[PDB]
Design an enzyme around this catalytic site. Structure first.
Site, short mmCIF file in Angstrom:
data_model
loop_
_atom_site.label_atom_id
_atom_site.label_comp_id
_atom_site.label_asym_id
_atom_site.label_seq_id
_atom_site.Cartn_x
_atom_site.Cartn_y
_atom_site.Cartn_z
N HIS A 179 0.92 -1.26 0.00
CA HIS A 179 0.05 0.01 0.00
C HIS A 179 0.75 1.14 -0.12
O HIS A 179 0.30 2.40 0.20
CB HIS A 179 -1.14 -0.13 1.11
N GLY A 194 3.51 6.36 9.31
CA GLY A 194 4.73 6.60 9.29
C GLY A 194 5.76 5.47 9.52
O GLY A 194 6.92 5.59 9.14
N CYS A 202 4.87 2.30 8.99
CA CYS A 202 4.74 1.12 8.04
C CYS A 202 5.98 0.73 7.51
O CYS A 202 6.70 1.57 6.93
CB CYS A 202 3.73 1.70 7.10
#
Lengths: 299, 299
Positions: free
Chosen positions: B41, B142, B144
């Site tokens: 993503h 942030g 991720c």
């Protein structure tokens, strides 16, 4: 979101851990530039520790009695020196991996990360606080010479070196100039720690972290005064709160919309009533090992 | 002695963290050999996350839409590929700092260390457990693409990559082949976690650590049976204990002189009576985020 007890990344410190043997005793050392730093009782046997005369014991050692090993490579010692309770072995080689660093003497209640090491190799990292009575509640198995540090940007602020376990099972050590925190000496004797009081400014900051993270049940309809809070504080062996402390919580007060004295009153009610089996941030007690700076940097 | 929640040293993982931008979205990536790994993503906007068709969204991207930055240096992407929920950016450069590594899919109840990162730079390290319902109670601001790992000797076993916060404020993610832990998908939707049950084998091992460290008050005069313990266990949302679990505690039983079922009965009484305001290992609740292996390696 979420709130965990966070250590600093340890890579910059791993590359500085070495092994220091002298006689039958081996422990961890810190290799920075062309100096290895380690606990001076590396020169003691067990029976020595009962009552050591460090000067007299150190006079019987020359540069070549110290075996400094950095990984599988081996350093040559061209000088040794006692500075307070740390030995400083001057070696011929600058550690290539020397980060930017400072030596700092931190204050009771401040926090730092420990890289627990065994025979010069890194075993673990965890975050702890210097207690008000200048002890550390740690895991020190062999681990002597492991160091504590904070990391500001690219620069490692070394603030602690482990030296000993007290008969009471908590730990004491020095700054990197060799001065012990607290009244402890590097001798295997009965030594008392004073009363282990709770770091009030840390609990408050942690209650703010709770609010920031949605744990709000503990917020009450009351408020209080500094004096009347401290009257309650000292009854529960809580460190007195000063106006410097109130000033430190300011950003947290601005974020949450809760003034320090209102939080103070919620903490009062918590101390006088207990927690009623209810948790805060997944804990059943009040945590005092986050500074206001920790909460800010994390949140 | 002493018992702290310990993370693995993170240096071997720091040297692998990179930043991956695609469009306006930036997150952390893992650079191993000539492959950067990151959450797929990274190709989504916020509105995309509501209901993304990853294949359709990915078709609109070429190699040059991915901006992989390793520190201040910049990598060239000669290939991109979706593997389950991870994107694999093939770059022209082997990471020189690639440690020995394996990809591992761990089991519910196992533990690992997270290097929380922000924009590719390391911010912190902490130790956590995969819950029985395949969530993590973490601190992901942030973050991720931050990864979880264990370290066996010189080899990093990568086991987790963070992908998302559920509306319930706990965290979900994948192994390094891209398969989520649990039933979660990388879509901003209501998703339920099942009931968060306690990892029984971990609590028991922690009670052993307590005994090893001198906290013994909780040991009782009773004993019990596996079946009758599990009957109590399932009433308190405790994971059922199996004979594999009993076998895992064996070393701890050998060290302390306390058989698993006796400890089981002390735990029963703890669950049925509470803790009476008394702590164990400085905690007011039962901790289930130490495996038996953790206790052994630490103690």
């Amino acid at each position: 979101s979420g709130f965990r007890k966070m250590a600093f990344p340890s890579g910059k410190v791993e590359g500085c851990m070495v092994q220091v043997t002298c006689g039958t005793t081996t422990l961890n050392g810190l290799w920075l530039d062309d100096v290895v730093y380690c606990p001076r009782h590396v020169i003691c046997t067990s029976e020595d520790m009962l009552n050591p005369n460090y000067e007299d014991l150190l006079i019987r050692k020359s540069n070549h009695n110290f075996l400094v090993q950095a990984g599988n490579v081996q350093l040559r010692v061209i000088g040794h020196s006692m500075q307070n309770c740390v030995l400083k072995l001057k070696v011929d080689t600058a550690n290539p991996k020397t980060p930017k660093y400072k030596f700092v003497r931190i204050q009771p209640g401040q926090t730092f990360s420990v890289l627990a090491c065994y025979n010069g190799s890194p075993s673990g990292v965890y975050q702890c606080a210097m207690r008000p009575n200048f002890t550390i509640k740690g895991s020190f198995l062999g681990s002597c010479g492991s160091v504590g540090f904070n990391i500001d940007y690219d620069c490692v602020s070394f603030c602690y070196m482990h030296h000993m376990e007290l008969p009471t099972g908590v730990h004491a050590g020095t700054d990197l100039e060799g001065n012990f925190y607290g009244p402890f000496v590097d001798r295997q004797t009965a030594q008392a720690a004073g009363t282990d009081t709770t770091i009030t400014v840390n609990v408050l900051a942690w209650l703010y972290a709770a609010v920031i993270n949605g744990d709000r049940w503990f917020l009450n309809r009351f408020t209080t005064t500094l004096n009347d809070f401290n009257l309650v504080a000292m009854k529960y062996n809580y460190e007195p709160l000063t106006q410097d402390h109130v000033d430190i919580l300011g950003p947290l007060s601005a974020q949450t919309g809760i003034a320090v004295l209102d939080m103070c009153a919620s903490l009062k009610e918590l101390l006088q009533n207990g927690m009623n089996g209810r948790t805060i941030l997944g804990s059943a007690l009040l945590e005092d090992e986050f500074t206001p700076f920790d909460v800010v940097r994390q949140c």
